[PDB]
Each structure stands twice: as C-alpha cells, then as structure tokens.
Amino acid sequence: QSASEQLQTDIPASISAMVLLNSACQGVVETYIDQGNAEHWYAQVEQNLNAVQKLVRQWRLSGNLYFSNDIMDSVLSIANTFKDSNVQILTLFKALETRFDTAQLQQLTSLILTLQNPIQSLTSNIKRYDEGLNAWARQVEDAHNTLQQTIAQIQQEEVSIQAEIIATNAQIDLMKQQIAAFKTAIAKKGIFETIFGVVLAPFTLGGSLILAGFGVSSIVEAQSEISSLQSDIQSSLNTINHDQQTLSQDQQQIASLNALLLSVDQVNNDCAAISRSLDTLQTTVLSLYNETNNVVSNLTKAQDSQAVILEQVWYQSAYNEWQDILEVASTLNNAQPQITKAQIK
Ligand code: NI
Ligand code: NI
Numbered sequence: 001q002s003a004s005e006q007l008q009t010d011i012p013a014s015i016s017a018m019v020l021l022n023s024a025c026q027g028v029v030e031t032y033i034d035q036g037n038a039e040h041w042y043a044q045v046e047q048n049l050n051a052v053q054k055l056v057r058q059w060r061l062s063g064n065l066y067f068s069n070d071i072m073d074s075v076l077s078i079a080n081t082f083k084d085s086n087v088q089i090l091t092l093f094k095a096l097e098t099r100f101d102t103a104q105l106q107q108l109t110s111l112i113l114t115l116q117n118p119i120q121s122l123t124s125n126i127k128r129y130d131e132g133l134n135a136w137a138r139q140v141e142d143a144h145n146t147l148q149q150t151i152a153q154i155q156q157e158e159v160s161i162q163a164e165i166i167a168t169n170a171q172i173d174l175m176k177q178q179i180a181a182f183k184t185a186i187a188k189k190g191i192f193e194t195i196f197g198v199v200l201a202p203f204t205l206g207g208s209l210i211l212a213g214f215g216v217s218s219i220v221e222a223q224s225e226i227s228s229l230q231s232d233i234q235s236s237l238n239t240i241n242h243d244q245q246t247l248s249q250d251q252q253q254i255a256s257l258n259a260l261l262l263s264v265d266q267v268n269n270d271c272a273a274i275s276r277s278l279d280t281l282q283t284t285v286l287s288l289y290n291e292t293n294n295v296v297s298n299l300t301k302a303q304d305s306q307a308v309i310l311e312q313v314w315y316q317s318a319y320n321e322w323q324d325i326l327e328v329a330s331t332l333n334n335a336q337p338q339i340t341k342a343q344i345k
Pocket of ligand 2: 242
C-alpha cells in the first residue's frame with residue numbers, strides 16, 4: 001500500500017468521525033429539563049447543563065460543524081496541485097525518457113517539489129485542529145463530570161425510589177451500548193444525519209419534564225442500522241416507562257436525570273475517536289511527504305534517462321489515486337446535509 005492508496009481510506013475515515021461530533025453536539029443543544037414542581041436541587045442541574053450547552057455553542061462558532069474546514073481545504077489543495085500539473089509533469093517525464101537533459105530534470109524536480117507545500121499545510125492544519133479539539137474536549141469532560149456528580153447526590157438522597165432509579169439507570173446504560181454498537185457497525189457519498197429526542201417523565205395531556213437528545217450520522221446512507229438503533233432505544237424507553245409506573249411524575253423526574261448525560265457522554269466519545277483517526281491520518285500524510293522527498297532526492301541525483309523514469313511509477317499511481325480523492329473530498333465538501341429527527345416516547 002502506497003501513502004496515497006492508504007489516504008483513500010484514511011481521509012474519509014477522519015471525516016466520518018468528524019460528522020458524528022456534529023450530531024453529538026446537536027444532541028446536547030436539544031437536551032432540556034424543566035423545573036416543574038422540583039425544589040432545591042433544580043438550580044444546580046440547570047446551571048451544570050447550561051455550562052455544557054455553552055461550550056458547544058462556543059465550539060460551533062469556530063465554523064467546524066460537520067468537519068474541519070482547514071483540513072478539508074488542504075486535502076483539496078493537494079488534489080488540485082496534482083490535477084493542475086499532470087500534463088507538464090507527464091510531458092517532462094516523456095521527454096526525459098527519450099533524452100536526458102539537466103535543465104528539464106531540474107524543471108521536473110521543481111514540479112514534484114510543489115506537492116510538498118500543500119502537504120505541509122495539511123500536516124500543520126491537522127495538528128492545529130487536533131490541539132483545539134483536545135483543549136475543548138477537556139473542558140467538556142470537566143463539565144460532564146460536574147453534572148454527573150450533581151445528579152448522583154440528588155439520586156442517592158431519594159432513598160424511597162432507589163429500586164426504580166436503578167432500573168432506569170440500567171436502561172440508560174443499555175442505550176449507551178446500543179449507540180456504541182451502531183457506531184461500531186458503520187465503521188454514494190454525502191452527510192446523512194439522524195437526531196433523536198427521548199421523552200421522559202411525561203404529562204398525561206402530552207409533553208414531559210425531560211427531553212434527552214442524542215445524534216448519529218455517516219457519509220454513506222445506512223437507514224437499516226439507524227432503524228435497529230431506533231427500535232432498541234424505543235424498547236429501552238418502553239422498559240423505563242414500564243418500570244416507573246409506581247412513581248409520581250416528580251419522582252420520575254429524579255429517576256430519569258442521568259438521561260441528560262447521554263449526549264454529553266457521546267461528545268466525549270466522539271472527540272476521542274477523531275483524535276485517534278487524526279493520529280492515523282498524520283502518520284500517512286508524513287508517509288506521502290517522505291515519498292515525495294525520496295523522488296525529489298532521486299531526481300536530483302539522476303544522471304540518465306533510466307534513473308528518471310523509475311520515479312514515474314510513484315507519480316502516476318499517486319496521480320490516479322488523488323483524482324479519486326478529489327472526487328470524494330469535493331462531494332463531501334459540496335454536500336448539503338440530509339437531516340431527519342426521531343422522537344422516542
Ligand atoms: Ni442538597
Ligand atoms: Ni415488571
């Protein structure tokens with residue numbers, strides 16, 4: 001596998017992990033709890049949750065909604081440099097094959113060397129995005145841990161409903177595993193997104209005191225995996241409602257609090273997955289850099305036509321791969337997101 005062959009896999013994988021974070025962020029923004037008749041503990045839950053939602057709005061103000069715009073533009077710049085220089089490079093390779101010439105050799109070497117400029121920008125833009133993502137993630141995790149600790153204190157004090165609190169927490173933890181199984185399973189291009197809302201502590205006339213959000217997304221359509229995820233989450237919620245039948249609505253509100261962490265926790269997961277995908281992508285981009293450095297070095301040292309054409313297999317293989325990368329990256333950069341919203345009650 002060459003570097004460019006690997007990048008055919010590694011580049012959509014990183015954009016794949018990025019789109020998920022948009023959906024997790026959207027799940028946070030759409031999570032809501034109303035005070036109702038609650039007393040004493042509500043103010044801090046509301047404060048903690050508002051603190052997490054503020055961090056998402058700050059993150060989105062960067063403009064990196066479905067993916068890093070700077071990483072995408074550096075990919076496109078590499079691909080366009082290949083596309084724009086193909087004929088001049090192939091012309092020189094051909095001429096040099098027939099008769100070695102020092103000036104044309106220096107010319108062809110300068111053309112390959114122009115590939116290294118958008119490659120440096122890509123590697124630098126990956127590090128700058130990863131650094132900002134990791135800084136933000138640590139703040140999200142701190143805020144998640146504050147809200148979690150608030151909820152644990154409230155719940156451990158409601159000694160008369162610990163049976164129903166445990167049965168509900170059990171279902172919430174199953175929903176987390178089902179979300180994780182979906183993401184495992186998905187690991188014609190576009191951006192396809194489903195946002196979920198989970199209704200808890202309902203009112204007889206309609207509505208509820210809690211709306212817990214989460215979201216998933218992918219760059220190829222996967223309507224079947226989404227449906228299985230939705231049926232699993234529905235069945236978990238139906239189980240929660242069955243197990244809370246013996247509680248008042250005010251007790252339902254307390255027993256359901258950890259659903260507020262569902263989408264916050266997914267933000268933590270998704271940030272981590274992007275970073276791992278970017279470590280992997282960084283390694284492959286440096287492997288492309290070092291292939292170009294080896295061609296530049298071999299061209300600089302070549303004395304005859306034979307030395308020169310040995311470097312043309314690297315070039316033509318990379319050109320063709322990069323024209324496929326161009327089409328995928330442009331499709332994804334041009335895509336209008338296709339969003340569907342699912343209420344689970
Ligand atoms: Ni208290
Ligand atoms: Ni039962």
